[PDB]
Amino acid sequence: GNKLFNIAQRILDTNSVLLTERGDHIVWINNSWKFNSEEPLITKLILSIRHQLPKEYSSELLCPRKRKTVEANIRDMLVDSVETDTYPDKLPFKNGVLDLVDGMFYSGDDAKKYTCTVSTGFKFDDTKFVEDSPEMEELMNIINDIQPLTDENKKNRELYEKTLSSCLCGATKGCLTFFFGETATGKSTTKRLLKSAIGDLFVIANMHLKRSVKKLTEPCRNHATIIDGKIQNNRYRFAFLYLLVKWYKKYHIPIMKL
Amino acid sequence: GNKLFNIAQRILDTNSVLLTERGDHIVWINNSWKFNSEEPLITKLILSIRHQLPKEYSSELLCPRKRKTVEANIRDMLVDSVETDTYPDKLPFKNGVLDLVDGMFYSGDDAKKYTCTVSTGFKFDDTKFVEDSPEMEELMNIINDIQPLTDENKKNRELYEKTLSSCLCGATKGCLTFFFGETATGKSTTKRLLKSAIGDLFVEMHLKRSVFKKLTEPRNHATIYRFAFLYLLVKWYKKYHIPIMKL
Amino acid sequence: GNKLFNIAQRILDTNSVLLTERGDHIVWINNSWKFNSEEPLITKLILSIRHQLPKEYSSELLCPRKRKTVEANIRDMLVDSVETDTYPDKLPFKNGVLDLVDGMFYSGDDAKKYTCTVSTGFKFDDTKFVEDSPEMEELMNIINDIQPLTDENKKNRELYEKTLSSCLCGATKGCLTFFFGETATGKSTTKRLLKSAIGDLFVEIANMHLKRSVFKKLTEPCRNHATIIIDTNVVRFRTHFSQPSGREAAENNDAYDKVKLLDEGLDGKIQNNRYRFAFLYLLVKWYKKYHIPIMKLYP
Amino acid sequence: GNKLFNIAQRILDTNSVLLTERGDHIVWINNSWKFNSEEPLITKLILSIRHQLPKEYSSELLCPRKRKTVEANIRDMLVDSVETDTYPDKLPFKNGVLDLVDGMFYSGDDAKKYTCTVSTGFKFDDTKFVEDSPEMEELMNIINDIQPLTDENKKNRELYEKTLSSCLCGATKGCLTFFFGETATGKSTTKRLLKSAIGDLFVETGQTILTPFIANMHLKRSVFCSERSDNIKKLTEPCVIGRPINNRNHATIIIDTNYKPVFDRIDNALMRRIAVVRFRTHFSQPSGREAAENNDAYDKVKLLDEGLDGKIQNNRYRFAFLYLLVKWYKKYHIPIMKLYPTPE
Amino acid sequence: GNKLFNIAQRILDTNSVLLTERGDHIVWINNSWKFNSEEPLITKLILSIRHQLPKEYSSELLCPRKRKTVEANIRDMLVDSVETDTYPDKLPFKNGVLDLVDGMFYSGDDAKKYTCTVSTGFKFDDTKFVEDSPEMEELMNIINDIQPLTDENKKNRELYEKTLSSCLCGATKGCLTFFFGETATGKSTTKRLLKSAIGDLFVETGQTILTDVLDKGPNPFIANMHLKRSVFCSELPDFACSGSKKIRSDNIKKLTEPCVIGRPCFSNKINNRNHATIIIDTNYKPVFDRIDNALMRRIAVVRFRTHFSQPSGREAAENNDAYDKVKLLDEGLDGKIQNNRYRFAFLYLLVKWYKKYHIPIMKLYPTPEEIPDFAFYL
Amino acid sequence: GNKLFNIAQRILDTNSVLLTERGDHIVWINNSWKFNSEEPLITKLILSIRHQLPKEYSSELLCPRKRKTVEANIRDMLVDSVETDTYPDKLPFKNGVLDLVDGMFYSGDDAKKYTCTVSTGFKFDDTKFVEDSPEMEELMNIINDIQPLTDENKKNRELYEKTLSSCLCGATKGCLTFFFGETATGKSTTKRLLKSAIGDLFVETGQTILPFIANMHLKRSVFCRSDNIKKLTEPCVNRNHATIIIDNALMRRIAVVRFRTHFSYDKVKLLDEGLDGKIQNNRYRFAFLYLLVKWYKKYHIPIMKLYP
Numbered sequence A: 001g002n003k004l005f006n007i008a009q010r011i012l013d014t015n016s017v018l019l020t021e022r023g024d025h026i027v028w029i030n031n032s033w034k035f036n037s038e039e040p041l042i043t044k045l046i047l048s049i050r051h052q053l054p055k056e057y058s059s060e061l062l063c064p065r066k067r068k069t070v071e072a073n074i075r076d077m078l079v080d081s082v083e084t085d086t087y088p089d090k091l092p093f094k095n096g097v098l099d100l101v102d103g104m105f106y107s108g109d110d111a112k113k114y115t116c117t118v119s120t121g122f123k124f125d126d127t128k129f130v131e132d133s134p135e136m137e138e139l140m141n142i143i144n145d146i147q148p149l150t151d152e153n154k155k156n157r158e159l160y161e162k163t164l165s166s167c168l169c170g171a172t173k174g175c176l177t178f179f180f181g182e183t184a185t186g187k188s189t190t191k192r193l194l195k196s197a198i199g200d201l202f203v204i205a206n207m208h209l210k211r212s213v214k215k216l217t218e219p220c221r222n223h224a225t226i227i228d229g230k231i232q233n234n235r236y237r238f239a240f241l242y243l244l245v246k247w248y249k250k251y252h253i254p255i256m257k258l
Numbered sequence B: 001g002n003k004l005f006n007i008a009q010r011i012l013d014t015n016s017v018l019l020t021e022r023g024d025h026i027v028w029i030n031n032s033w034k035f036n037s038e039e040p041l042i043t044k045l046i047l048s049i050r051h052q053l054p055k056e057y058s059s060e061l062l063c064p065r066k067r068k069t070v071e072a073n074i075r076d077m078l079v080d081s082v083e084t085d086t087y088p089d090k091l092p093f094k095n096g097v098l099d100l101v102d103g104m105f106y107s108g109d110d111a112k113k114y115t116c117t118v119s120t121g122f123k124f125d126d127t128k129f130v131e132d133s134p135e136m137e138e139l140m141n142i143i144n145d146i147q148p149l150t151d152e153n154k155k156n157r158e159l160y161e162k163t164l165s166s167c168l169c170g171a172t173k174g175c176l177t178f179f180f181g182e183t184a185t186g187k188s189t190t191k192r193l194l195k196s197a198i199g200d201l202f203v204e205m206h207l208k209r210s211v212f213k214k215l216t217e218p219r220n221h222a223t224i225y226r227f228a229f230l231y232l233l234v235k236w237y238k239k240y241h242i243p244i245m246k247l
Numbered sequence C: 001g002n003k004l005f006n007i008a009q010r011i012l013d014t015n016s017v018l019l020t021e022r023g024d025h026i027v028w029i030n031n032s033w034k035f036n037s038e039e040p041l042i043t044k045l046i047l048s049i050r051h052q053l054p055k056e057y058s059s060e061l062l063c064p065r066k067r068k069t070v071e072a073n074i075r076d077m078l079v080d081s082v083e084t085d086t087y088p089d090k091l092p093f094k095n096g097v098l099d100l101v102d103g104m105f106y107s108g109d110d111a112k113k114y115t116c117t118v119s120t121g122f123k124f125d126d127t128k129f130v131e132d133s134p135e136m137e138e139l140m141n142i143i144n145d146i147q148p149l150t151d152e153n154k155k156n157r158e159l160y161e162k163t164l165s166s167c168l169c170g171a172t173k174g175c176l177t178f179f180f181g182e183t184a185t186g187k188s189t190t191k192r193l194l195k196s197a198i199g200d201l202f203v204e205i206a207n208m209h210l211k212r213s214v215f216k217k218l219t220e221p222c223r224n225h226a227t228i229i230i231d232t233n234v235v236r237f238r239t240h241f242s243q244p245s246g247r248e249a250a251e252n253n254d255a256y257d258k259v260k261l262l263d264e265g266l267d268g269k270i271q272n273n274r275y276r277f278a279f280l281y282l283l284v285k286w287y288k289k290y291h292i293p294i295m296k297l298y299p
Numbered sequence D: 001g002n003k004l005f006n007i008a009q010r011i012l013d014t015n016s017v018l019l020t021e022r023g024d025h026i027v028w029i030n031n032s033w034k035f036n037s038e039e040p041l042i043t044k045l046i047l048s049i050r051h052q053l054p055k056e057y058s059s060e061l062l063c064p065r066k067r068k069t070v071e072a073n074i075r076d077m078l079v080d081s082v083e084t085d086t087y088p089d090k091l092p093f094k095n096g097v098l099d100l101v102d103g104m105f106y107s108g109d110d111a112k113k114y115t116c117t118v119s120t121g122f123k124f125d126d127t128k129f130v131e132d133s134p135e136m137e138e139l140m141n142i143i144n145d146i147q148p149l150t151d152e153n154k155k156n157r158e159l160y161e162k163t164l165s166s167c168l169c170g171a172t173k174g175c176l177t178f179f180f181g182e183t184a185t186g187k188s189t190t191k192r193l194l195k196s197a198i199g200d201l202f203v204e205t206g207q208t209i210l211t212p213f214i215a216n217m218h219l220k221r222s223v224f225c226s227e228r229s230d231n232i233k234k235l236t237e238p239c240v241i242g243r244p245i246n247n248r249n250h251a252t253i254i255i256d257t258n259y260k261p262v263f264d265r266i267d268n269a270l271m272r273r274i275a276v277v278r279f280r281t282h283f284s285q286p287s288g289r290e291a292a293e294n295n296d297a298y299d300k301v302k303l304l305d306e307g308l309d310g311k312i313q314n315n316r317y318r319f320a321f322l323y324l325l326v327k328w329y330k331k332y333h334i335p336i337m338k339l340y341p342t343p344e
Numbered sequence E: 001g002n003k004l005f006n007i008a009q010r011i012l013d014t015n016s017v018l019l020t021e022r023g024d025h026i027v028w029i030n031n032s033w034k035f036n037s038e039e040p041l042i043t044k045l046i047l048s049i050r051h052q053l054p055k056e057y058s059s060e061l062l063c064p065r066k067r068k069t070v071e072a073n074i075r076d077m078l079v080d081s082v083e084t085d086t087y088p089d090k091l092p093f094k095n096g097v098l099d100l101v102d103g104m105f106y107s108g109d110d111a112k113k114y115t116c117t118v119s120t121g122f123k124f125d126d127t128k129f130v131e132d133s134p135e136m137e138e139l140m141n142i143i144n145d146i147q148p149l150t151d152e153n154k155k156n157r158e159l160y161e162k163t164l165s166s167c168l169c170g171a172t173k174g175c176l177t178f179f180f181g182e183t184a185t186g187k188s189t190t191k192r193l194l195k196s197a198i199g200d201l202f203v204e205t206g207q208t209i210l211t212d213v214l215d216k217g218p219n220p221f222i223a224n225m226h227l228k229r230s231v232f233c234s235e236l237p238d239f240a241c242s243g244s245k246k247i248r249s250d251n252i253k254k255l256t257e258p259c260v261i262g263r264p265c266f267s268n269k270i271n272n273r274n275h276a277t278i279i280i281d282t283n284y285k286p287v288f289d290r291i292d293n294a295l296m297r298r299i300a301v302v303r304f305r306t307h308f309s310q311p312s313g314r315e316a317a318e319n320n321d322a323y324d325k326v327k328l329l330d331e332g333l334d335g336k337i338q339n340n341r342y343r344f345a346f347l348y349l350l351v352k353w354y355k356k357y358h359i360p361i362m363k364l365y366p367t368p369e370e371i372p373d374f375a376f377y378l
Numbered sequence F: 001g002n003k004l005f006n007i008a009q010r011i012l013d014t015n016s017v018l019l020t021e022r023g024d025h026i027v028w029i030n031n032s033w034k035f036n037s038e039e040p041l042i043t044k045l046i047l048s049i050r051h052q053l054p055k056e057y058s059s060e061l062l063c064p065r066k067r068k069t070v071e072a073n074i075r076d077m078l079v080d081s082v083e084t085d086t087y088p089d090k091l092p093f094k095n096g097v098l099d100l101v102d103g104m105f106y107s108g109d110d111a112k113k114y115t116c117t118v119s120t121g122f123k124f125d126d127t128k129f130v131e132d133s134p135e136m137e138e139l140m141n142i143i144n145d146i147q148p149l150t151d152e153n154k155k156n157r158e159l160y161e162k163t164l165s166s167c168l169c170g171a172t173k174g175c176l177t178f179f180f181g182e183t184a185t186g187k188s189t190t191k192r193l194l195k196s197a198i199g200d201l202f203v204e205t206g207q208t209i210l211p212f213i214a215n216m217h218l219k220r221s222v223f224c225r226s227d228n229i230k231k232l233t234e235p236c237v238n239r240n241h242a243t244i245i246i247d248n249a250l251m252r253r254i255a256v257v258r259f260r261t262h263f264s265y266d267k268v269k270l271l272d273e274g275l276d277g278k279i280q281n282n283r284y285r286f287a288f289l290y291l292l293v294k295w296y297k298k299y300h301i302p303i304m305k306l307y308p
């Protein structure tokens, strides 16, 4: 056939570009399913796949007028859409995906099979998701101070942990939990802690695919659960992420329900 | 005279592209009458149909700038509009159209003639639409639990079956059905079961075949487990709505 | 000298494309003046007229890049705006324009002279505009039940006929006509009959433009061709139409004077357009009885 | 040099395309200064002017891509703007300009030095602008039946004539005029006659002006308001504030009312911008005629014709009223133009 | 090398095109720093400077596709922003710049140094900016009619002189000025005289900028009053009746800052340089929401006294105490003002007034003694 | 291969064009990180870099149709977003960056590492940032006139200098501040002095706040419902570096300094009619910048916090 057509065919065969019902063309570059419905991110992918093609097919794509032909060819081959965020027990990081059934981290093509268009926005450092460090004990202490562990507060702590641990699911939640409290009881502190824990999955048009923010209990797509100085430096991030994963694995194994 | 016009004529001879009174072009790719106004799919159909054209006409379609010329020729050749969604006794699934009176499942070219724009949403699997399944037993039990075949639920059962089977027709319904009752009776359960049955043809209204004097006016088709409840619905249609559809 | 300018001049010779005061290029294809201020229809016209020009001129129109050249030449040669819908005594169908005053229906080039952009939305069936058919007699019975030809109802009947026939003129009406009456009297039956009769030129301010029928500011030409009709619960209505259960609702109240039997099947046999061309014949017949010299409605 | 640049230079030297202080490029074709900010109207002129250049510079212009080059050069050569509509005593028709002070219809190059970016919207036939015609007598009878020339109706008749004829200048009218009268006496008849006569230079607007309907009334000579104090103080100045932010007010404001108007604020400043003409000749239907003469709010009663509006909308009484307007104009507005208020 | 890049560099050398802080590219054609943020005006300049280049560098600019290239190069060669209209004491006409310090005229490169993007909107004729002319004498007569040179009117006349003179300099005035007067007194006459004298450096606005939260939504009444040296806001009705919005006080301090905040229709440029002499044409005493000393140092007033009326109303206007003198109303005066007959004489008079009153520094003073509530607060 | 691709690679290897998290591209020309979301500013960088490449690569950039190919290649070779204005304690001028920690001024590549986009709006004159100069003594004269160095108002004076010196950093403050005072008290004099000192990092917006937010992004000082107060002291509202100067939670979010001396109260002084004229022209700009830097390195060197 044609060189600029075989290049598009070979790029498509790698399943690096996909089409989603919102009309979006999700692109796989830098180990994250990216998308931007304002300018073609595909051309970035034809430029990236350059070190994945034969030599005769590699020098062709060093021309921006030749990375629009292949982009159009690719855009005209995506005739059938692909479902997104099929798996709820998955956490997308800027370098892979994390499974909440056993708490390990995938990277590269291992995270490609789990189509997660949205992401937490930051990389998952390996030597921070540890059991103990000079951040775990202080986090545990402040969590106890905010939400005491006593008998009359035991059920309150249980529902509290169940509510924050729910802010990882990829499915919609049909239940509401109230955050009633007096002045200066740490609500903003927990808000910032959870924001540091997940990040981009935290904020009606903007809250798409977000996992936390009768009309806000319907499947349509939303997944959100509706509810100092050494925080913005992003220190308690991985410790609180470990706590959230532990609470999820302790409370949300079989069925997700609030 | 012109290869890129002979190709357009051959593509239009297959009746794959039609024009709809909204001024919009609907196309036929992978067994679905799709349509879009932001990224027209006429080029998608051009690049899809190359296999059905001769070799000399197939090598010319492998080019994005030679595929916006055939698209221009085709769009310039569609002068008059065509009507969509005429047949009322059809069920459009993502892989064909199923007849209600006949009950035979159509797929591919046989499904093209019935211009069914709105689809059920989900693909239809042949080896699930059976009368003997583990799920259909429990579905029948649930149906009997929601409403029994008792003395006070004989004519109510008839109206229930008639109204439920009515949510399969492309015509305009002539009556409204109410669901007055107490909590935990089967209202929302039946709502979710019907949603799982007829899929996309459901809103909780343009060509939507179910919605939960102005309503009973012509466009709208509304009546204001995917293979067992569907079997029960088609059976109810074959008991109730055979010669004429009325509510 | 320049083939794509000779082609543009020749296409302009046929007077197929016109420029409107609104800025929209009306186009003549498929016996209807279609226009669209979102995409130029002119290129479809250039492609369509291909089978009229010499063989050398025709082969240059199988090239979409040589058709925007012709369209650009044509658009640069159209300076004189041409008024639309100047003739009010015409009813535009999808295959031409019917003349109400005389009675025949024009088609093809004959309908081009009457620049009629809006149309009825449905084709004009030739063998349906007939005085006698198994549907005009039942329809006339429907009027007789709704509006009997009694001495007291004679004035009502004439006013009803005049108002119904007035929804066929492209002029501007200067009178509001009411549909006063009680419930189940045949108003909405008349509305359904009218919708089946005329079709697209029926609405139930910008949207209500260039329409002939619709359901002091509304009675001025500034365009507005609509016959404004208001339904309230003045052509008065008496013959309430009762049901079988309303059979026993048919002998006390003087808001009515007659109670024919309800016919639930009738309503259905309207949207099917069973009484369509019968109604067109009745409207036209009535029209060339009150508005032949001049069309006017008396307040 | 470049051939298309020579073509553009020649076209620019015939003064056929002009640049205004609004961003619009006004084009001169069909004896009219048109403008439209949706299409490069200049690219029409390049074709139309084609029958003025030598044969060498003619066959080139049969190419749409060689008239975007010529237009690009032209738009690059119009460095200076030109003031437009500085001549008030001219009436522009779609085929010429009528000079009112002598009533002469200029066409072609003669009707070009008077830049007129807004026209009446129709052509001006020479062999209808005459004083001897049956339509002339019909229109004169209608006008006499509307405003009789009797002794008690002299000053009002003069005000009516002055106000009607004043909707022919491009000057700024510093006054307001009412058509105060009871229903069905001829105010809408006068409105339709004026619309048929002066055509496009006539706009009807809603009551929100009196209490984006101000941006469209730009360069219109007559604004009729059928059916707030400072609105009057805003509407009689050459530059009125309106955004679709300043518009030139060449408009005579006529207001159609049925009762005595009541204003929000009454002061000595408002009475010097107001004028009223009374309508006293009711035209009632023959069935209801006997109920009109007994009424005291009117003075005369006549027969209400039915086809009059039909023939008026058909623009049959157009040039007769144009002649009447010109004749009135060359009786009060020749030395200067000024609208005199009448507080009483 | 490249021929088109050499052309672009030569054009850049002559300092004809410039880049402004607003992001707009200003050009230099026909001795006027014109700019237009809807078309790349630069492409006109490339043609106009065609004669200022050698023969080989001239024939390359008779090709609009070859002038788009030069325009692109110029847009890619101007990396540094410039601040325009820095010199305040300059009056830009359509054919040069008049310096107010001593009143000579400049053209060409002499006037190019002062990058005044705005202009008055009309050409400047040399043999009219004189001291002896029939138009000058009659203009002096009508000005003395508007403001008599009496001792009772002496302070008012002098402050009127200064206020009119201030509408020539490009500084930022911090004192609002009122034109309190009764109907038919000359406020609109002075307004039209200014409009004929300074032309473009003059806009009209509605009372909205005085009674409105002038930040919500797109407001083009503020985005137009940028670099204009005189702003007129007529139509101030009385506030005694219902439905009248009092003049919002903070707007007075808002309008006297060196920058004004406002957004036009669908734009993000909220800052506009405020060189305007905000002058209010009113009829009665203005009333604000709250009166204080912070608002008291931004308000100056001039009373207009001599009335104009035809003999029909002369008897009724003579006995009115709201006036002090009555003169015969002229009918063709508006006609001979709207045709700019009184333009250059008034411009010369304004220049003389500025040279006599504002030569050392430019500053304005308030006159808080002519308002009842203001006087009570004293 | 391709010459334009190699040119784009060489341009990127110098790290002059970056892609920010907002989706916009920041460009390093004339010792300033300039960005503008209305046209590609990359092409200006392509033409500026022209005197850095091999002479065979330089003649290819004298062509606007070949400076859009290089820009296109660059636009597809920036796949990783980069955060902006990480360094709080740096003051960006149109010709470099001043390091507030010690007081030295960097320029060129030395100021390229500090990716701070919003500059002050002017250049840094080397021979004016001096402690002694015949425009400085008058500056602390007028400052002491505005705020006398009295023991009674010493707390007010230290609060004043602490709050005004805080308008130089990219950190987020968590408390509103007010300049509530009487008429003719130097409040707008302080506003204009600060505007001369910092320039672009200074925005004035009406009381609608109390697109008017979309412009005050990365600005280090701004001027002018308690819910909006609770919304205006957060790291995001659009970044929030502004030192906003115009229940218990409201109590810990409000700081006000009360001006005392009046000019034409505790002391009445004489008005200076020419003071504004010699303030708008930025006469005291660099002397006040020096004073602010001195106050900063005297007060905020260990950590930044504005206690109420």
Ligand SMILES: Nc1ncnc2c1ncn2[C@@H]1O[C@H](COP(=O)(O)OP(=O)(O)O)[C@@H](O)[C@H]1O
Pocket (backbone or CB within 6 Å): A141, A142, A143, A145, A146, A183, A184, A185, A186, A187, A188, A189, A228, F249
């Ligand atoms: N364990 C803890 N150690 C230190 N500070 C704490 C702890 N728990 C709560 N706080 C303080 O309590 C405050 C919570 O107030 P916050 O919930 O933000 O009030 P509001 O939401 O009304 O502004 C935080 O500023 C935090 O510093």
Ligand SMILES: Nc1ncnc2c1ncn2[C@@H]1O[C@H](COP(=O)(O)OP(=O)(O)O)[C@@H](O)[C@H]1O
Pocket (backbone or CB within 6 Å): B141, B142, B143, B145, B146, B183, B184, B185, B186, B187, B188, B189, B190
């Ligand atoms: N066969 C059945 N009969 C009754 N209830 C059922 C049956 N199957 C499931 N249910 C459960 O009982 C509930 C019935 O509630 P329903 O009648 O829908 O009213 P609501 O949803 O408002 O409570 C459902 O939530 C459903 O989960």
Ligand SMILES: Nc1ncnc2c1ncn2[C@@H]1O[C@H](COP(=O)(O)OP(=O)(O)O)[C@@H](O)[C@H]1O
Pocket (backbone or CB within 6 Å): C141, C142, C145, C146, C182, C183, C184, C185, C186, C187, C188, C189, C241, C242, C260, C261, C262, C263, C264, C266, C267
């Ligand atoms: N002669 C008739 N033929 C057929 N149907 C009739 C006749 N008379 C009455 N009907 C029926 O009676 C009904 C009258 O209702 P209608 O008068 O339209 O109610 P409303 O006036 O409130 O709109 C119609 O639906 C019509 O079908």
Ligand SMILES: Nc1ncnc2c1ncn2[C@@H]1O[C@H](COP(=O)(O)OP(=O)(O)O)[C@@H](O)[C@H]1O
Pocket (backbone or CB within 6 Å): D141, D142, D143, D145, D146, D182, D183, D184, D185, D186, D187, D188, D189, D190, D283, D302, D303, D304, D305, D306, D307, D308, D309
């Ligand atoms: N001179 C005349 N002779 C006969 N009929 C007239 C004459 N003038 C007007 N008419 C008729 O009388 C009617 C007058 O209505 P009009 O006064 O316009 O109503 P309104 O003033 O309430 O808008 C018109 O329809 C017109 O046909």
Ligand SMILES: Nc1ncnc2c1ncn2[C@@H]1O[C@H](COP(=O)(O)OP(=O)(O)O)[C@@H](O)[C@H]1O
Pocket (backbone or CB within 6 Å): E142, E145, E146, E181, E182, E183, E184, E185, E186, E187, E188, E189, E308, E309, E327, E328, E329, E330, E331, E333, E334
């Ligand atoms: N000597 C004069 N100088 C200026 N204007 C005069 C003079 N004599 C009469 N006038 C008249 O004054 C009118 C302008 O005053 P006007 O616009 O009514 O002021 P305002 O609108 O502020 O009341 C002009 O129409 C002019 O004819």
Ligand SMILES: Nc1ncnc2c1ncn2[C@@H]1O[C@H](COP(=O)(O)OP(=O)(O)O)[C@@H](O)[C@H]1O
Pocket (backbone or CB within 6 Å): E294, F142, F145, F146, F182, F183, F184, F185, F186, F187, F188, F189, F263, F269, F270, F271, F272, F273, F274, F275, F276
């Ligand atoms: N210490 C001072 N010495 C001299 N003049 C001063 C002093 N303080 C203030 N001023 C004068 O006061 C004016 C500023 O007043 P300002 O505080 O802005 O009042 P407001 O804030 O009410 O507008 C300046 O023009 C300045 O000349």
